[PDB]
Symmetry: D2
C-alpha cells in the first residue's frame, strides 16, 4: 500500500541506498516510528507496510538526502526531505511517494491509485 | 531502450491517454517522425522503439499536455511539453523520460540506466 | 536574510496568503518557534528575522500548503511542505526558500547569497 | 510584458548568463525569431519585448540549458528547455517564465498577471 521512489536529478539515475524513515503521528502529536529501509538499485523501497497495518492517519516520510549527497562527495543544502500527508480510506488504495533530488532542491509528488 | 512516463500533479495519478510523439533530428535540422503512442493506465508508454532503431542522435519527445488538461475540463498554459535530448552510446542504455504535469507548470527528468 | 516565495502551479500566479512558520532547533533538540508570517499578493514573505537574530542553527521552514489549498476549497494531499537546513554556519548568508505548489505535489529550491 | 527567470538547483543560485531565444509562430506555421537575451547576475532577463510588439500569438521560449551547463564544464542531458504557450489572446497580460535547472532535469512554471 506504500512505496517510496527516489530519483537523482544530477546524475539522471535512481537514488540508490538512500535511507528512508516512515513515522505515524500519535495521539499526543509526536511522531512514532512506523517503517524504514534503504532504496534499492531502482531507487525504490517496497515492503514498508501491509494493508492491515497502514490505517488512516498522518504519516511522515523522511528521506536522508544529506547522507546521499555526502556519499557522492557533494555538499547539499537540506538536512533531509520530509513528506507529510494523510492516508484516507475514501481515496485510492495504493500510495507511491516519489521524490526528485538535487543538491539545493527537491520535488515530490504522490501517485495514488487503485 | 526508450520509455515515457507522465504523472498528474493535480489529481495525484498517472496521466492516462496522453498523446506522445517522438521525433529524430534529421541532417537538415528538421524533425522527422520517429515513434508515437498514448500513455497507458499507468501513465507509461512502452514499445516506442527497438535497440536497432534507436541510434545516437538528438530526439524530441512532445507530450500533448493541452489536450490532456482540456479533456479534464481544465484550461492549461502550455501548448505541449517538449523534451529534447541527445542519445549517447557511451552512457547507459535505457532511457526513461518522466514528466510531472500541472496546468501552468511541468517538470521533467531523465532516468538513464543499464 | 530570510525570504520565502511561493507560487501556484494550478493558477499560474503567486500563492497569496500562505502561512509560514519557521522553527530553530534548540540545544535540547526540540523545534523552537522562531518566526512566522504570511505571503503577500506577490507570493513573498519578507521581514521574518534580522541578521542579529538569525544566528547559526538548523532551521525548519514550514509552508502551510494544506491550509492554503483548503482556503481555496480544494482537498490537497500534503499536510505542509517542510524545508530543513543548516544556516549561517560559514557566517551570515541570505536565504530565499522558494516553493511551487500543486494539490498533490510541490517543489522547493534555495537561493543562497553572500552579501 | 515578458520576463524570464532561471535558477540553478545544483549551486543554489540564480542561473547567470543563460541564453534565451524567443520565437513566435508565423502565419505559415514557421517559428519566427522574436527576441533574445541573456540572464543577468540575478538570473533574470528583462527587456525582451514591448506591449506593442508582444501581440497575440503562440510563443516559444527556448532556454539554452545545454550551453549553460557546458560553459560550467558539465555534460548535461537536455539540449534546451522549450516553453510554448499562447499569449495575449484575451488581451495583454504580463508573463514570467521561470525555470529551475539541474543537469538531468528541469522544471518550469508561468506567472501570468493582468495589469
Ligand atoms: O512510480 C513510479 O514508478 C515512478 C516512475 C517515474 C517517476 N518519475 C517521477 C517524478 C518525475 C519528476 Cl519530473 C518529478 C517528480 Cl517529483 C517525480 O516520479 C516517478 C514515479
Ligand atoms: O518571479 C520571480 O522573481 C521568482 C522568484 C523565485 C522563484 N522561484 C521559482 C521556482 C521555484 C521552483 Cl521550486 C520551481 C520553479 Cl520552476 C520556479 O520561480 C521563481 C520566480
Amino acid at each position: 500500500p506504500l512505496m517510496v521512489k527516489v530519483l537523482d536529478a544530477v546524475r539522471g539515475s535512481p537514488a540508490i541506498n538512500v535511507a528512508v524513515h516512515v513515522f505515524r503521528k500519535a495521539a499526543d502529536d509526536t511522531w512514532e516510528p512506523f517503517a524504514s529501509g534503504k532504496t534499492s538499485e531502482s531507487g525504490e523501497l517496497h515492503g514498508l507496510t501491509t494493508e492491515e497495518e497502514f490505517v488512516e492517519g498522518i504519516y511522515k516520510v523522511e528521506i536522508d538526502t544529506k547522507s546521499y549527497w555526502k556519499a557522492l562527495g557533494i555538499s547539499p543544502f537540506h538536512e533531509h526531505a520530509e513528506v507529510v500527508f494523510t492516508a484516507n480510506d475514501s481515496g485510492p488504495r495504493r500510495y507511491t511517494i516519489a521524490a526528485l533530488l538535487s543538491p539545493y532542491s527537491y520535488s515530490t509528488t504522490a501517485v495514488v491509485t487503485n
